UniProtKB/Swiss-Prot annotation, chains A, B, D, F, G:
Catalytic machinery residues: 32, 146, 177
Gene encoding the protein: aroA'
GO biological process: amino acid biosynthetic process; aromatic amino acid family biosynthetic process
This protein's name: 2-amino-3,7-dideoxy-D-threo-hept-6-ulosonate synthase
SUPFAM superfamilies: Aldolase
Amino acid sequence: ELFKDIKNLGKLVRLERIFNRESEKTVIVPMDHGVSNGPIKGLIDIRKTVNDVAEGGANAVLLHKGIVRHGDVGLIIHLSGGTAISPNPLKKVIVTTVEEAIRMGADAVSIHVNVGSDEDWEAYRDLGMIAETCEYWGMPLIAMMYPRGKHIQNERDPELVAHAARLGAELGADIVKTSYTGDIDSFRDVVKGCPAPVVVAGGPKTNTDEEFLQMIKDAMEAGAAGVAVGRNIFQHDDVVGITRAVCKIVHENADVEEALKEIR
Amino acid sequence: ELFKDIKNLGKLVRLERIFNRESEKTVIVPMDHGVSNGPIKGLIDIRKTVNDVAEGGANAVLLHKGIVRHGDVGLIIHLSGGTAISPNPLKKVIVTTVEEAIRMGADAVSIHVNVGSDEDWEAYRDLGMIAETCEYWGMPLIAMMYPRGKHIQNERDPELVAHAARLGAELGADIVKTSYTGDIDSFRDVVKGCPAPVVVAGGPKTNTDEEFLQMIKDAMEAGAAGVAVGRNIFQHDDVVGITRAVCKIVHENADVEEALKEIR
Amino acid sequence: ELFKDIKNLGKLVRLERIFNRESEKTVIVPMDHGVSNGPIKGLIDIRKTVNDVAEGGANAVLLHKGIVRHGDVGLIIHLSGGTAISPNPLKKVIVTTVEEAIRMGADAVSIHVNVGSDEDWEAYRDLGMIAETCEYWGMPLIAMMYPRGKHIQNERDPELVAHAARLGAELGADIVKTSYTGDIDSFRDVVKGCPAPVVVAGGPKTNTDEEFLQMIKDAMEAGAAGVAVGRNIFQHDDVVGITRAVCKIVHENADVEEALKEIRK
Amino acid sequence: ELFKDIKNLGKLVRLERIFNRESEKTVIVPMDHGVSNGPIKGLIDIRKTVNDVAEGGANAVLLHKGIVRHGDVGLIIHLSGGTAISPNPLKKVIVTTVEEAIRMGADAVSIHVNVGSDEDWEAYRDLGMIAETCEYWGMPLIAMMYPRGKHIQNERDPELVAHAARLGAELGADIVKTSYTGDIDSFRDVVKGCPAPVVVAGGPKTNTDEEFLQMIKDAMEAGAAGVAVGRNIFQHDDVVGITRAVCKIVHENADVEEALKEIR
Amino acid sequence: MELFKDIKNLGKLVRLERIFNRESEKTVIVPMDHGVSNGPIKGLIDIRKTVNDVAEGGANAVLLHKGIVRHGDVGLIIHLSGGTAISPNPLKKVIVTTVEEAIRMGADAVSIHVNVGSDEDWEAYRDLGMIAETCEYWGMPLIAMMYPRGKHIQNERDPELVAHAARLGAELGADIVKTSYTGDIDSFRDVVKGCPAPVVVAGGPKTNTDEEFLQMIKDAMEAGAAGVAVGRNIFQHDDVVGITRAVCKIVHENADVEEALKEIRK
Amino acid sequence: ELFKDIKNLGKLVRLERIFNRESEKTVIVPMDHGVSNGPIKGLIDIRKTVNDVAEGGANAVLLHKGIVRHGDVGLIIHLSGGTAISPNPLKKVIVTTVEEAIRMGADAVSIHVNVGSDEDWEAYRDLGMIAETCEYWGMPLIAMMYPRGKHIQNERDPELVAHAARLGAELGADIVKTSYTGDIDSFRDVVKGCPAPVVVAGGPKTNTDEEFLQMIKDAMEAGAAGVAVGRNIFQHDDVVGITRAVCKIVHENADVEEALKEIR
Amino acid sequence: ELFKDIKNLGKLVRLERIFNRESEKTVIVPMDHGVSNGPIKGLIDIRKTVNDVAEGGANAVLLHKGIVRHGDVGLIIHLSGGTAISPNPLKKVIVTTVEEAIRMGADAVSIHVNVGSDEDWEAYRDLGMIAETCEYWGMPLIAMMYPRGKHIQNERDPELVAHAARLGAELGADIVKTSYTGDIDSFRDVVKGCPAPVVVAGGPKTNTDEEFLQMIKDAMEAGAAGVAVGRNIFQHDDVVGITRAVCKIVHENADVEEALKEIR
């Protein structure tokens, strides 16, 4: 098992609702962008998007409580908030509690920490604290760790990303979301340096499908436990198909050539 | 039903006291300006105002607890505070609790978030947190979301307003108050991008009864679930009449000509 | 009845111990200056001042818990603190709780908000929050609202004062203490714009008893529900007499001539 | 007004949703019998009963939280429970909290105290305690006070009923439900001896409609503030009509003859 | 005020001064909590009136249940105990009101009733002791009505039982004790001397003659009572205002029975 | 929809893990007998039974926290405890909290109330109280209501059972477990008198599988929302087969003659 | 490993301090008799008994907090209290909290439940509740379950003991202390019917050593996870030797024959 070390009945039960039993990998489609960037392309009719991603084979959707309250897969409730309109766009505060996510039937919660941002230590505490709440409630915690701030030019730097992922594991996250470092070798270092399974983010919408799918394929190669892509899936012309494509690569290890056949 | 998705008995019961059953739209007359600008025109004799507006047919009045403690419509208690006299006029802090509003018999509470203001992330947290308190108490929450800050020249910008409204919905507000973007098309984007029903603000007192009523008419066209105008109603020569005019337009779908006739 | 809208048994009961039943007005002598300015003239022998002003006919004294703990008339416990020695003299923080004031037998509590001061929004929250505590405990709350800060030249500006008073009422205060605006008309605007009864502060000690008493007389004219003067009373040569003078103007609607007569030559 | 003495904004607001503004009287149809006697006649299809009652002009229905949770008038949530199957059928325990009733949007709560029953002092405490909770939350409290126990032969005895009603008012109830004492004079003593407005119970289904309507008419004469009948209304052949009869008597002081015309 | 010179509690001192006469340092309390125990009895049907009359006669304070206060200038004492004659155990008393509730109502004091000798009376011992601490914290003066009542008590006025009962109240924390007069000045002086807290006498059921009653109060004062707390003998009298005035004469001014009677009209 | 009236996101999500989506019925195999009767036949190797039963197609198993703490279907945690060895075998106390069940990943909790037993009113309170805890946490609550006590000769009496089930619904249970009344007509009354879906108990092991399967068939006919049988399944020679048989009747609505076939 | 199933880091760590790593069995010497029977033989100089037993190689001593507060082996703090002088000698109440035991450095806590005693259901609740506290704190819980009460003649009855042990496991105990049933076969039923490891009590001092050591030998044969004897050890002439003897039989599968060689 992937979580043979997790000595928490609650977490094991819930984690099984977001990870594919056979492949022991996960395809998470985060759709919390509304808070950060407003109603962007693909997240305007969230009810449809969630539904397609689900039909496409995604293991879980990641949303803010407000969206769940309105509109068959795993549910991950995001706990962090911050916007691009804010005088400090990198600031993240806790906007939702673990308890709220639990009473909503969520299978997991997620937090976002911009390591390197102003007063990022406040988020260090939030993560560590929420980690304990999650441990008590048997709620699996996904920590999106990113190296972002005034002194960080390359938010994809292998050292910074590996550090950021390690931070997440050290403080208690069960799973870590982070950026792909650009190449299989450096990303394998991120994976090896992080005691918790790592999942890659999709990044902004790529120009060519082959581009995006190859990145996911490489990340899996490096040892990723799955993926957590938003924009590259819901901003695609064929949401269901592109999701299906990603599932091929992640759960079946099918190559980009066979994957692409899924894109209608 | 507008809130067919709201799975909260308490909220449904209370929401019915601020929305017209037939039309499923609302006319809210916010009168919390006292805190922001002092005793302005129309809000000096609040007791009279509330009654005239009630007569005109407003569905609910929005006040600060202190005013309710003193002077047949629905009641919405405002939870946010900040003044123009403050060294940071855009700052808003929580001045009243949901529990206080509940023990006062209020049918809903409202919060104001100036997205883009200094330390606006603190209000993001307040909103998210209060949203959970409201969910627990079955208290409908109206979130007044506005793009306002040092780097925002046009607080009516379609992108900023749509983002602001989205933010409110994502964080848990049941209803969103925001500025009209100036034209039916851009505002329809605000409405479509926000999962929660949107209500328009009146803005400062306009020069003519048509200017104002046309704006409300357009907003309804764009898909607004109603209106929440203060100044344009209580600062009018015929409060009861102008309110009646707004109701015509909002609940019965009358056009400006047919509505203006209600003014004296 | 002045509080015929107050639907709170506890507050009504307590308010009656600080307001004159007949005049429906109040003469409050605040003596919390110790915290702000140290042991100033008149507040050195606080035990004497209180008794002196009490004999003169004051309805209530306003003190910090520490002074009450040491050495008839009503008691108002102040909840705010800040000093002139502080790098931010306009800052006010909550130094006493409503519960503490209640277990001390106080009839009311007071808070001070310098609207316009740095991070004054934090005091907005304190007021709003404390207002709820007061509502729960049936403790009447007096909010001293003043326009003070880096961008305020005239802290007596009619618009700013009226706004400040309104703020107090909106956030939950039962009574509002504020500065007189200088003239009957502008102050009447403050009174009319504030849903809660307003009480005037005395300001620094005046040169004449005729000026001070005239100011109070004018304020009453403008519609004040009473007065809350400190310095002009306890820093006077004849504390008892000056207090008696003020009571005539507030409770018996007498004139300045007939009132001045109460002072010991 | 009837609640000119009630110095509680929350209670006044809520009480207005269960009392007729003009008559200052109320017609409450309690339907909490399910807990006490199981699914009896008239309470099997509660959704329909509530519909007809409301339809018939009733001011409010009184239910247990479980029934509300399933299927336009005022709502009173009952807080007491006990059954006829219990080894002590007269025992009543608190089964629902005031807070729960508040988050459900209820306009009031009710408690049942069998004065004279075993360990009835425990209910005295419950009433007194709940009374305080209600006072804090601005929730009007209806106390059903009845003289019932091993040493009480006549549960309609004027002295016992007057005492029971007094008890309710002394301990904090805003309204008191009790049995009619059989005659206008003795019941007027109950009303005069109880500082809180008194409402009469209907008792078991009567044989003739006049037997029942006359009783209500007499109770109003004695000074009752309204009625709270269950069985005599929902167990009637024409629920809407009989309700409608009761209202005409209570709200318009029509006589039994004009009242009976409402029955089909 | 010499009566409570030992009370080291600012709150209690302030409040106690609103129920005790500054000069006589005695108190005339008119308890009207009978509604709960016996229903709307004679004199307590129009409580608003009784309360106003009693105040008109000069009583220092009225003692009521929260419900009655809630329904439309004397001191106010909120009763916290409840039990009824209709109950299968009429001597049982449970806490029906909290000290906090009394405080937020503006009450100047709270009262508890303990029937020492009744079934599970130890539960009331705990209530008293516990409430005493709540009162101490809130600066709320506590009046403990202590009575020897139960299955094995034939004479609820027995000097030994009453003195014990009063002592219990003081030991557990009551600031003032209400109890029955023992029938004679000497035995009652023992009750007063054995109880560290000032003792106030109950009126008992309505007497046949104004003399029986006023003489009893006069004797109690003689024995050292700090005042009186009579209900029935005052509000069930033909001239409530006058009989109250009579009682005040005795207690507050040490007038004698003959002079006190001059206050009762008719 | 069976739970269309349930306005609780958490409960809906969890309820879907114990009810078959197509038939909207459920097959629950309660195995909490250990506490009541010790290690009886079939519950000695609980780990086996749970899979044996799971294999046959059951929707959920019902266990005490202790058993879960040790040994793929839905999980219901029992909260009530009492034993046959107790001087009062009908007494039930709360031995587990809803919170504990939640942190264990349970999909629901159950309580047992012996209506008619000594101090059964204490369980009335427990049920009512726990119902509120369940409502807050979004945890579906199953209430096993049974008429049992010194004065109840026939614990299967139609009136008593219907009353007991009603009690459960009134106090807040989402689902009710109760005994079959012996015939389709009387049990239909139980179902109709209870606002919450009713599930039948299996009772002690029957002589022939026809009698048992016929009983279940009849119960479904009467309108049962499914079944909750323990002994008749785990004490059977072919646990997997008998479970499969039961599923055919409840999920496929098969007949005895055909259902009896699955029995290997 | 014995606690292969225990998914609780805290418990695993602590349990290792009371169980022999190589044998996965335990020798616990309970000395809480002081509370029950006063200062009996062997427990007068507790400081000496604890050390004597320690030298004998016992894995842990079980004491009441008061004794620890005065005086290298594992420590188990007892939480139950009751005495033979009590009008109800079988009554047990919680006299110590899990938290207190934790801040004292204890490795485990124990509770005593007399199944069948008056109001024993109150102890059922205590066990179930304490079990949850233990689970949260990672404190292993030992439940001493015994069938004792007015209707129990043979407190060693195989059925009653097996039931009692099962009860402990069902309610959450990690380990169960109980009486030996008299013969290897019936006791094996107790062990098999209880999901938690079972440890045997020593009972009153036996006349001969061969009597006692044989009993322990048989219990181990039946599948016991160790022993928890008090009187038979500390009331022996050679405490150290008899303890050594027990360790041989229990920890090394030694024979009664071989063991007795340890008694000097």
